[PDB]
Design a protein around this ligand. Structure first.
Ligand code: K
Ligand code: K
Ligand code: K
Ligand code: K
Ligand code: MG
Ligand code: MG
Ligand code: MG
Ligand code: MG
Ligand code: MG
Ligand code: MG
Ligand code: MG
Ligand code: MG
Ligand code: MG
Ligand code: MG
Ligand code: MG
Ligand code: MG
Ligand code: MG
Ligand code: MG
Ligand code: MG
Ligand code: MG
Ligand code: MG
Ligand code: MG
Ligand code: MG
Ligand code: MG
Ligand code: MG
Ligand code: MG
Ligand code: MG
Ligand code: MG
Ligand code: MG
Ligand code: MG
Ligand code: MG
Ligand code: MG
Ligand code: MG
Ligand code: MG
Ligand code: MG
Ligand code: MG
Lengths: 209, 203, 53, 53, 95, 98, 144
RNA sequence: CCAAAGAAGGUGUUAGCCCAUUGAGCCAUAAACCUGAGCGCCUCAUGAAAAGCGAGUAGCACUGUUUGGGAAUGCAGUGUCAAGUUGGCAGGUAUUUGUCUGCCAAAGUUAAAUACAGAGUAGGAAGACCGAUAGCGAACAAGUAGCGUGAGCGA
RNA sequence: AGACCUGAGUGUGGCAGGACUACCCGCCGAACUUAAGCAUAUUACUCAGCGGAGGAAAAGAAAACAACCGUGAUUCUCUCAGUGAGCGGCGAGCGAAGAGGGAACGAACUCGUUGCCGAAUCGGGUCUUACAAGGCCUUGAGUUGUGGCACAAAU
């Protein structure tokens, strides 16, 4: 009596189980709530230690790769030296200011650089730089009142200064134009797809003629 | 600089003059011991590329290893079990001879830290590598930021754990991404990642 | 995981006029040849020992 | 405002912002005696909503 | 001892095998009289010692080196490549 | 400078339309720049040392006139066709400079 | 829970529902999927046809992200149009604009009758969907 | 009668008030750690105002092994072995051509998130677990008595 | 005579040796078992064996992904995914990687090389309270090259 079942592929033929003869290969999560509490405690202790600096450094906005996620936005690793230059900042100094720097990420378009430069402008406008010697204030440093004002950003993503990542706004309701009524969209898309799909064979048949 | 001329000369290893020099050197090394201390490296350019400095506390040893494939040490060439595991002569050691020489030098002189090694000569019977070693107790080593790290206790016998360049070579750490996904950080680490059974608390 | 099994117990086989349960090896003690490894044995391992997963 | 009620044996404290079913129905039996402060009582429309809001 | 036999046999084996011109050119050396003259001229223009340089830098503290031969493989090679060297002297037994 | 995209998921210049920036200068661009000093050092060393046995065989092949055989020999010794072409070109240049 | 299993009911039955004759033995038919072509052929053949053999070309490094192409039908476009947007929508007037890729769809399919006319921005579209959505007074806008 | 203390241990029966406990707080302190990179003195340091970049290497061949890696994922032995003047590597079906993208191997150091699947030190918190044939072999002068030539076995 | 090179012998100052080894790193490496037989396969790149370190180790700073509107060291988590990948007497069975949500992250640096310098270096004595990242002295090492400045976060 086996009957009509799924064919099993449970994948448990190795010595995963801890027994008298086997140490086993397992990973339980019985420490998960304790580890979550430990992480929050460590974040609070770190925030108290680096006060008044925001706990998370500033990160840029990037576009998620691949055609599945290219409509999504997230925080990148660090601001490029081109964005930092366009914001009027030296990258080595920006690293000390609390801005993450990534020299690997190239700016292949103007929009991403503009978004990150706006983030940098807003951050430097909201930045309160403490003087190295408060008895001798320099250009760009804060005053006694601002230093006393202090206050610390404890946001999860270090985004209080610059907000969350900005998505393009939705298009407002509109009226269909005469061209949109007339045009055959499927034919246009299909011919554009065929232009690349049969490009090699079309070019080969272009030869021999 | 002079380095360019030395390096280009050492890229012409099969030329007549280099073959003559290597013939004389190979004869000399054949009539020497398995481990030989050297006052100065045979290839100063290669040694300095690999981290050797002409400073107190830097040592160069030349280590000889025998060539050929590994012979499985079973009595009278008799294996048991499946015929899959019946080979005696055709098997190869999964660690290169450079790492073997580094480990021999390291296990012989346990008061030194192995830094790197380079190929110096080859023969029909032997291969020679010159191993760079550092004295952790030398003041020049301990007060020099460049080589200061090797005094730390985590670098004791790093050749025995495969952390040297030859060890990294035979561990597959020369590659990244899709060529080394199952090799990183090590085979054991990836095997633990891919084979431990995970029990989430709520499931 | 080792709670009933820290012995070199082996069955004696048939022909000795005793049950075929594995028994503690050696001599000189009161556990010598005393039956082992079974959930029905005095110092043996429980049936289906409990797990933390 | 729980300083005076902590040590009272037989009086359990609660926060309206986190109501526990294990305390609202001890043993799975509904119908627990609950004392409401006016400020916590007035938040029940916001916290749990209504049939329409 | 082994090292004595090895050095003697090494000289023998270098004499016995066919030595390519790149290595054989170092066997043919400058004449003894010309070698003595070149060594004397270099001796006259020897670089400053540690004490001489220390005294000169102490003297200059109340406010470069004198002309000398270029020594050291890196500096001599740089002098040769830039063609600043009027004459270069090379040893025949560098190992 | 880069070709703008058409805003269509398909076609020759498919893709979302952004204002593309040109490729920026990189320190890696010098790898495709002629290395004159390295060439001079290599020529000096090659003149000093002579020829490889592989180079002698290829030069005899080229003097005889079996270019295809020289290319096959270089391919077998070096393992790649591009390297074989380069080595045969080097030996032909060496022969011309004689 | 252990008190609901057949084990509790079978205390004192001496066989636990495995019989006196056949008995409960370790592996009377092999382990797992053994014998799919020998002594388990009928089960595999009538319950899992097509299990053995090969079919089709190979795709060595398959990536799901380039292949991402979820689809939505015309008669399900109200799921993306809001309530007041749907209420104020008719032919020749101001129409809601639906951004498919922001809503998680790539291609627009033409099944059913479109309820509320709208302007759809889609990466792909079927010819029937395009024809129907134009006949209803809406439109399709290609996007990448 | 206390309760900002109801905390669960002890005391001759079941103890908030018999005891210990259960707080705010006080005293002391080698260095190290934290505090306008705490605050002085001497000394010592210190800020700004053209070329080419890792060679028995990488590749190929054969053989072995390993991998999901499949005309060969990584590695090993031997053979023989580069390029850098239009370079090299990767782009998961072999070859020869082109065109595009990334990236620049063959030297090295680096915290934190991660493990502790029969470790250890100093402390803690416990448990819908076991309750002396159970739970560790061992709640006891237990790896003890005892056995074996021995490895070991072992109450 | 003497020098250099290559090797010895003593004095002086140090280090290695064993233990631990639960996790971690390198090598070596089975069979029982499953396939209802069994040889490839599986168990398993596991057990046993040898070597090595730490409080974590290992990895780590692109000769990386990808093919995007692009991302951006390493590690780990959920997912990807028991997979319309793939490997398999294509049988039994094995079987990952991009992307996306996250943890963590002041995360970056050091040589070699190439240019410009060329002992400015390092050890010893001795003095500054001081085996100073200091000053003086020292052929003692070192020019068969120690050290400084510049190399895309640069100008
Ligand atoms: K055999
Ligand atoms: K087998
Ligand atoms: K309390
Ligand atoms: K090889
Ligand atoms: Mg056991
Ligand atoms: Mg200050
Ligand atoms: Mg991973
Ligand atoms: Mg027991
Ligand atoms: Mg009965
Ligand atoms: Mg039944
Ligand atoms: Mg039956
Ligand atoms: Mg077929
Ligand atoms: Mg009591
Ligand atoms: Mg201060
Ligand atoms: Mg390189
Ligand atoms: Mg090679
Ligand atoms: Mg295998
Ligand atoms: Mg490391
Ligand atoms: Mg522990
Ligand atoms: Mg007991
Ligand atoms: Mg007992
Ligand atoms: Mg040891
Ligand atoms: Mg088993
Ligand atoms: Mg079988
Ligand atoms: Mg059977
Ligand atoms: Mg059998
Ligand atoms: Mg395996
Ligand atoms: Mg083991
Ligand atoms: Mg330890
Ligand atoms: Mg480490
Ligand atoms: Mg990454
Ligand atoms: Mg899934
Ligand atoms: Mg699924
Ligand atoms: Mg496997
Ligand atoms: Mg992520
Ligand atoms: Mg240098």
């Amino acid at each position: 009596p086996k009957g009509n079942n799924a064919i099993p592929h449970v994948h448990q033929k190795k010595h995963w189980n801890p027994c008298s003869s086997q140490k086993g290969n397992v990973k339980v999560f019985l420490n998960q709530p304790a580890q979550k509490h430990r992480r929050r405690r460590l974040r609070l202790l770190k925030a108290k230690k680096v006060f008044p600096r925001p706990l998370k450094a500033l990160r840029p906005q990037v576009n998620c790769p691949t055609v599945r996620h290219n409509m999504k936005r997230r925080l990148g690793r660090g601001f490029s030296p081109a964005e930092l230059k366009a914001a009027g900042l030296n990258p080595q100094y920006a690293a000390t200011i609390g801005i993450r720097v990534d020299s690997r990420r190239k700016n292949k378009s103007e929009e991403g650089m503009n978004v990150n430069v706006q983030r940098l402008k807003t951050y430097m406008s909201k930045l309160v730089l403490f003087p190295m010697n408060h008895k001798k204030v320099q250009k760009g440093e804060a005053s006694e009142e601002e230093v006393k004002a202090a206050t610390q950003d404890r946001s999860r993503f270090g985004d209080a200064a610059v907000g969350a990542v900005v998505y393009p706004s939705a298009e407002a309701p509109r009226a269909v134009s005469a061209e949109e009524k007339s045009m055959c969209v499927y034919a246009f898309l299909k011919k554009n797809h065929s232009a690349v799909r049969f490009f090699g064979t079309r070019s080969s048949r272009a030869a021999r003629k | 600089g002079a380095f360019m001329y030395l390096n280009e000369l050492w890229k012409k290893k099969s030329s007549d003059v280099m073959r003559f020099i290597q013939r004389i050197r190979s004869w000399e090394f054949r009539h020497q011991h398995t481990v030989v201390r050297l006052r100065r490296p045979t290839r100063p350019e290669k040694a300095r590329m690999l981290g050797y400095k002409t400073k107190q506390g830097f040592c160069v040893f030349r280590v000889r290893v025998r060539r050929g494939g590994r012979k499985r040490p079973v009595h009278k060439g008799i294996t048991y079990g499946k015929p899959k595991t019946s080979g005696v002569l055709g098997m190869k050691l999964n660690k290169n001879n450079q790492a073997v020489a580094e480990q021999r030098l390291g296990k012989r002189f346990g008061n030194l830290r192995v830094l790197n090694s380079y190929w110096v000569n080859m023969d029909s019977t032997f291969k020679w590598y010159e191993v760079i070693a550092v004295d952790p107790m030398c003041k020049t080593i301990r007060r020099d930021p460049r080589i200061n790290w090797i005094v730390n206790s985590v670098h004791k016998h790093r050749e025995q754990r495969g952390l040297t360049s030859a060890g990294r070579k035979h561990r597959g750490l020369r590659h990244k991404g899709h060529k080394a996904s199952k090799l990183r950080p090590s085979y054991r680490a990836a095997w633990r990642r891919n084979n431990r059974i995970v029990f989430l608390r709520k499931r | 995981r080792l709670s009933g099994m820290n012995h070199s117990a082996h069955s004696w086989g048939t022909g000795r006029a005793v049950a075929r349960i594995p028994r503690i090896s050696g001599g000189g003690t009161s556990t010598s040849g005393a039956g082992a490894f079974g959930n029905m044995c005095r110092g043996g391992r429980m049936f289906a020992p409990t797990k933390i997963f | 405002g729980t300083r005076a009620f902590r040590n009272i044996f037989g009086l359990d404290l609660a926060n309206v912002s986190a109501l526990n079913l294990l305390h609202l129905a001890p043993g799975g039996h509904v119908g627990r005696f609950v004392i409401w402060t006016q400020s916590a009582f007035e938040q029940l429309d916001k916290i749990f909503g209504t049939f329409t809001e | 001892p082994t090292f004595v036999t090895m050095q003697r046999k090494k000289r023998v084996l270098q004499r016995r095998l066919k030595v390519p011109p790149a290595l054989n050119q170092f066997t043919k050396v400058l004449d003894r009289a010309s070698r003595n003259e070149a060594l004397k001229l270099i001796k006259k223009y020897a670089p400053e010692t540690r004490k001489a340089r220390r005294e000169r830098l102490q003297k200059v503290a109340e406010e470069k080196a004198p002309l000398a031969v270029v020594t050291g493989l890196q500096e001599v090679t740089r002098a040769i490549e830039k063609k600043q060297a009027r004459m270069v002297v090379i040893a025949n037994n560098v190992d | 400078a880069p070709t703008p995209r058409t805003g269509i998921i398909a076609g020759f210049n498919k893709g979302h339309v952004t204002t593309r920036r040109p490729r920026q200068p990189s320190p890696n661009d010098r790898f495709a720049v002629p290395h004159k000093h390295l060439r001079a050092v290599k020529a000096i060393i090659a003149d000093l040392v002579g020829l490889s046995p592989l180079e002698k065989r290829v030069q005899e092949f080229l003097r005889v006139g079996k270019e295809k055989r020289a290319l096959k020999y270089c391919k077998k010794r070096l393992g790649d066709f591009t390297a074989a072409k380069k080595k045969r070109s080097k030996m032909e240049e060496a022969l011309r400079h004689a | 829970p252990t008190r609901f299993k057949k084990c509790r009911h079978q205390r004192g039955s001496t066989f636990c529902g495995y019989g006196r004759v056949g008995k409960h033995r370790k592996h009377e038919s092999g382990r797992g999927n053994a014998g799919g072509m020998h002594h388990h052929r009928i089960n595999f053949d009538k319950y899992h046809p097509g299990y053995f053999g090969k079919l089709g070309m190979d795709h060595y490094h398959r990536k799901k992200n380039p292949m991402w192409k979820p689809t939505i039908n015309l008669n399900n476009l109200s799921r993306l149009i809001a309530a007041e947007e749907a209420a104020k929508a008719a032919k020749g007037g101001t129409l809601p604009v639906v951004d498919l890729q922001s809503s998680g769809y790539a291609k627009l399919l033409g099944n059913g009758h479109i309820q509320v006319p709208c302007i759809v921005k889609a990466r792909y579209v079927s010819k029937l969907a395009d024809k129907k959505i134009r006949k209803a007074g809406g439109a399709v806008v290609l996007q990448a």
